[PDB]
Every structure is written in structure tokens, then in C-alpha cells.
Amino acid sequence: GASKLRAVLEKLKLSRDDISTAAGMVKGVVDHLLLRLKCDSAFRGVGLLNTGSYYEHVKISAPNEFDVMFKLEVPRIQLEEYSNTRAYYFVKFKRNPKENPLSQFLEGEILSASKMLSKFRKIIKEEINDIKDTDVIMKRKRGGSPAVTLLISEKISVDITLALESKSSWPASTQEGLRIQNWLSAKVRKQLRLKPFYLVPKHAKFQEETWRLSFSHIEKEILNNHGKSKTCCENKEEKCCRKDCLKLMKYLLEQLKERFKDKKHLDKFSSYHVKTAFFHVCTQNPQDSQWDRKDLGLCFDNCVTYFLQCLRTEKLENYFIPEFNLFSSNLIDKRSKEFLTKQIEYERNNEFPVFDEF
Numbered sequence: 443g444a445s446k447l448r449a450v451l452e453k454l455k456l457s458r459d460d461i462s463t464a465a466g467m468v469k470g471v472v473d474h475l476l477l478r479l480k481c482d483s484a485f486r487g488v489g490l491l492n493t494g495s496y497y498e499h500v501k502i503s504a505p506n507e508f509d510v511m512f513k514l515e516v517p518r519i520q521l522e523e524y525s526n527t528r529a530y531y532f533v534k535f536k537r538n539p540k541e542n543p544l545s546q547f548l549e550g551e552i553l554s555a556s557k558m559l560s561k562f563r564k565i566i567k568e569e570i571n572d573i574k575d576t577d578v579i580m581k582r583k584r585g586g587s588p589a590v591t592l593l594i595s596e597k598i599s600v601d602i603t604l605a606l607e608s609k610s611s612w613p614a615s616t617q618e619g620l621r622i623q624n625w626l627s628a629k630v631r632k633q634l635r636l637k638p639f640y641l642v643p644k645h646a647k648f649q650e651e652t653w654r655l656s657f658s659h660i661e662k663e664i665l666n667n668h669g670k671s672k673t674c675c676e677n678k679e680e681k682c683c684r685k686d687c688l689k690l691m692k693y694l695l696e697q698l699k700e701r702f703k704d705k706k707h708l709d710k711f712s713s714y715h716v717k718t719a720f721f722h723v724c725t726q727n728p729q730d731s732q733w734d735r736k737d738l739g740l741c742f743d744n745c746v747t748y749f750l751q752c753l754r755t756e757k758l759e760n761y762f763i764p765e766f767n768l769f770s771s772n773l774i775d776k777r778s779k780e781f782l783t784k785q786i787e788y789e790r791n792n793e794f795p796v797f798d799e800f
């Protein structure tokens with residue numbers, strides 16, 4: 443019941459100070475990398491994007507896995523959607539008056555992601571080896587985003603993502619996304635869509651010089667300012683359980699991944715999937731009275747049941763790009779989704795024995 447869920451949440455709090463100090467090490471390394479990058483003429487105006495709960499810029503997606511985004515203001519953006527994929531784009535430049543600092547990365551009229559990543563990597567691996575003080579290990583990663591994974595000390599690994607910043611209107615593929623009007627209001631949806639959007643070098647399936655839309659800054663804003671009431675969670679009368687439900691869903695997936703590690707059935711699933719499903723459940727349940735702290739058990743069941751539906755139907759829409767299905771067969775194979783469906787179903791039907799202490 444909810445008492446078991448509350449106990450899980452209390453257990454997770456015991457890790458807080460270890461996370462804070464570990465995020466503190468990520469922070470110091472990143473601050474160092476930022477100042478060196480700014481020396482290169484192409485990465486002049488590089489900066490840290492506000493996406494995380496630690497020091498504005500350090501984000502957790504799983505215990506000991508930290509996430510940091512480097513933003514780069516790139517004016518005159520011009521996007522060309524890569525063949526009906528809705529989330530992947532070629533990057534061109536609207537006009538030519540000044541020759542852009544990223545001229546070096548052009549292959550024709552198109553900004554090369556793999557060219558720009560190579561320099562980004564070269565500069566980082568240059569400073570990572572040019573540090574006597576602390577051993578910091580770079581592992582060139584799977585492809586595109588994240589660009590670099592550093593390994594600090596033993597278990598701390600920070601992913602570092604480069605992101606182009608566009609202050610232009612969001613692409614047409616987002617026009618029916620961010621369906622927050624009945625929850626956070628039409629006024630807020632308008633304000634959020636006036637903010638920049640970001641492009642990360644992720645490559646569509648093998649390769650291409652494509653970039654993927656990213657809204658990590660908006661995700662943080664709507665998790666931290668998450669109520670229909672402006673004063674949700676600002677006083678003792680308005681304590682909702684939205685953040686606790688997302689935490690429990692992330693922990694559920696983390697624990698199942700560890701239990702099913704012998705055959706790695708669940709490798710493709712991520713906290714981003716559970717976060718996306720959670721945002722959809724917020725749209726479905728827009729009133730703060732549907733997230734009363736006393737109803738933690740029912741609220742968590744709402745979240746789990748919707749995630750199960752996404753698995754069984756093999757459909758999880760990106761919250762910002764509705765026609766981008768995170769659970770398509772191109773991204774996650776059918777047998778993986780069928781397998782997780784069965785395990786989530788079992789957990790729900792048995793009151794989550796994966797959360798048992800005995």
C-alpha cells in the first residue's frame with residue numbers, strides 16, 4: 443500500500459548527501475571545461491543550460507549517472523526536417539551577412555554534427571588529460587548524444603551534451619505538443635513556447651548529420667512549477683504527490699533493470715521514458731486534488747497503469763513532439779516491450795514486491 447511507498451521514499455532520502463557531494467564534483471569539473479571551450483573561436487559563447495536540480499546545471503537520470511548540457515547560441519537558424527521523423531533535423535543558416543563561427547563545420551549548406559562533435563571531443567579530451575590534480579577518464583560513447591562521458595573517481599560518470607540554442611519559434615512538429623492548457627493553462631503554454639529550443643547532435647537510424655530537438659529546460663520548469671495552483675507545494679495546505687510519484691516510477695524501473703540484469707532485457711528503457719509517461723499522466727489528471735498526498739497509492743497506480751498501457755500499445759509520444767513515438771519498433775524492439783509489459787503487470791498486480799524489504 444501507500445505505507446510501503448512512503449517507506450521507499452524515506453529510504454531514497456538517505457542517499458541525499460552522497461548525491462549532493464557527488465554532484466559537487468561534477469560541478470567543479472564542468473566549470474573548468476567551460477572556460478577552456480570559450481577560448482576556441484567556434485565555442486565562444488558556450489554556456490551551461492539550466493536543466494538539473496543540482497547547481498542549476500547538474501542533472502541526475504539515475505544514481506551515479508550525472509547529466510550536463512552545454513548550450514551554444516547560434517543565430518540565423520534554418521531547419522530542414524529529416525524525412526518525416528519530426529524530431530530530427532538538418533541545420534542550415536537563414537542568411538549570410540556575417541560568415542558564421544561554425545563555418546568550419548559546414549559540409550555544403552548543412553552544419554555537420556559529427557564535424558562539430560569531433561572538435562568538441564578533441565578540446566575536452568585535451569583538458570581531461572591536461573589535469574594533474576584529479577584522474578578523470580573520458581569514454582567516447584555510443585554515438586552523438588551524449589558527446590562525452592567522463593568518469594570521475596570510481597563510480598561518478600557525467601555525460602556532457604553539446605546543444606545548439608535557437609531563439610526562433612519552435613518547429614512545426616511541436617505545434618500539437620506540450621498539451622498543458624487544461625493543467626498549467628494556455629497562458630503558460632504561450633510563455634513557455636516563447637523560450638528558446640535546443641538541438642543536440644543525435645543521429646537517426648545508423649548515421650547522418652542530423653540534430654534532435656531538446657526541451658530539457660522546459661521539462662525542468664514544468665516539474666518544479668507543476669501545479670494548477672500557483673502555490674502548489676508552497677504551503678502545508680497544498681502538498682501534492684506529483685514529484686514523489688515520478689521518483690517512485692524512476693525507482694521502479696531502476697530496480698527492475700537491476701533485477702533483470704542477467705539477460706539485459708530492459709537495457710533500452712530509461713528514466714526519460716518514465717518521465718515522459720508521467721507528464722502525460724499530469725495532462726490526464728490536471729487538478730491538484732488528483733495528486734493529494736493522502737492518495738499517494740492511487741496516484742502511483744495511475745502512473746504505473748498509464749506506463750503499462752504505453753508498453754502494451756508500443757506507443758509513448760514525446761511530450762513536445764506528438765508524432766515522435768519513443769516506443770516505436772525502430773527504437774525499441776517488440777520483444778523488449780512485451781517483456782517489460784509482463785513484469786510491470788506482475789508488479790502492479792502484486793502491490794510491487796520489488797519494493798519489499800523482505
Ligand SMILES: [Zn+2]
Nearest residue numbers: 669674675682
Ligand atoms: Zn505540488
